Amino acid sequence: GSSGSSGEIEKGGCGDPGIPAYGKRTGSSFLHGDTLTFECPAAFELVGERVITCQQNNQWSGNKPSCSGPSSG
16 A cells, blocks of 8 residues: 545535434434435335435435335335
8 A cells, every 4th residue: 555645625515414313324424425314113114315415505415314114025
């Protein structure tokens, strides 16, 4: 392995899309280029964008997901 890129600078971030009341989110922090994923327990099916990606435009590509649906097996 070898050295990499350097440089220290402050960055903004999409915003505070909050957390859904149907599942759990991973990544309380939201930076430019960060991906926020979600998950739902049993007796629930993913109903939306499993994981979104910031657009460095004070906005998100999609809204928070959801949880609703029967079992699988």
